[PDB]
Amino acid sequence: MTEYKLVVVGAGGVGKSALTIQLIQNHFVDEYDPTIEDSYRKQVVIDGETCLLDILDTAGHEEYSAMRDQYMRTGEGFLCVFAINNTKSFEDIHQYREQIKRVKDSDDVPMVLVGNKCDLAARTVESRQAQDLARSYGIPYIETSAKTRQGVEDAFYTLVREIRQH
Amino acid sequence: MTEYKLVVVGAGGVGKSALTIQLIQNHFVDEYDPTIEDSYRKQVVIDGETCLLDILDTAGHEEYSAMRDQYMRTGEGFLCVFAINNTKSFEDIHQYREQIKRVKDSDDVPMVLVGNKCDLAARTVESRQAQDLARSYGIPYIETSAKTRQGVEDAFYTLVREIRQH
Ligand SMILES: Nc1nc2c(ncn2[C@@H]2O[C@H](COP(=O)(O)OP(=O)(O)NP(=O)(O)O)[C@@H](O)[C@H]2O)c(=O)[nH]1
Ligand SMILES: Nc1nc2c(ncn2[C@@H]2O[C@H](COP(=O)(O)OP(=O)(O)NP(=O)(O)O)[C@@H](O)[C@H]2O)c(=O)[nH]1
Ligand SMILES: [Mg+2]
Ligand SMILES: [Mg+2]
């Protein structure tokens, strides 16, 4: 079947693992549990086609330097996550977008900027500015909540459809 | 606020009204009830921005000839619906795609092909062929169910994001 190689990327503590666990195992993890690397494979059906989602869950900071080169090389699509209450995680997004362009020799590489944690009332990153960043890059922007499950299927599936259309 | 002028288009009986009612009033209509025109305005929030969705619910066949010219003129985005158990409604999609290009003087006009009724087990339109049609046009393809609510927020919101990015 079609496999879709997704890698979820972004800063430490943004919720990429609680995103991937909501999708894969339907429940919110409120644990402190930093990732070196976790891989989830799941036979799924998206718009009538069956496919296996092969998600790679990555570390926020880690040793992880040109040591990211290797997974952004194999990955077809990227979820670029930041949290809407962490202004620096929003700013580090240019670090990941460019390095993914550098290792991929591409300017269009299927991607989607995910503003996570939109259940929390004290936010510091307005959607207007986050939507501009995503329009600057020619990329979809989607706000999520791994607490509430708001938009997690939407981030994942829009990204698969971005790969389908590239 | 941003308003988003959506018009839902496609053949008679495909479920465009049960799509719009699922979205607007959360319930499945299993009624025989043909549309001349219905308009739904709803303040909503999509990815942190508040906006009013101004949906125009249209007739499948009707008198409706160059009398469609007027709404495809005002509309910003289109949901092009067919049902996955009605092969001719899948084929009439080129009628609507071209006329929307003709009245809009455009080749990229925000749109999304919706394969409705994916709860029903006897289907005649494979997703593979429907996904090709949507890749031919450079358009998202999304399967829905107004019975089950599967994918109705996904058809509507992907379409708003298509307008945001155009
Ligand atoms: N309120 C709220 N909390 C969330 C959300 N997603 C994750 N969290 C919380 O945020 C913290 C970090 O979550 P985690 O998913 O481990 O983040 P990570 O970005 O994957 N961390 P790492 O970079 O080290 O791999 C946890 O306490 C988790 O419960 C969300 O949508 N909203
Ligand atoms: N099983 C199933 N039935 C549906 C679905 N959507 C609509 N229906 C049924 O299909 C029939 C036609 O629905 P309707 O929404 O009125 O279609 P329309 O395309 O809007 N008709 P018109 O072109 O005349 O405006 C109704 O009996 C309705 O209950 C769906 O997702 N699945
Ligand atoms: Mg993690
Ligand atoms: Mg109708």
Swiss-Prot record, chains A, B:
The gene is HRAS. The modification N-acetylmethionine is found at M1. This is GTPase HRas. Palmitoylated by the ZDHHC9-GOLGA7 complex. A continuous cycle of de- and re-palmitoylation regulates rapid exchange between plasma membrane and Golgi. S-nitrosylated; critical for redox regulation. Important for stimulating guanine nucleotide exchange. No structural perturbation on nitrosylation. Belongs to the small GTPase superfamily. Ras family. Transmembrane segments: none annotated. The modification N-acetylthreonine is found at T2. GO terms for molecular function: G protein activity; GDP binding; GTP binding; GTPase activity; phospholipase C activator activity; protein-membrane adaptor activity. Widely expressed.
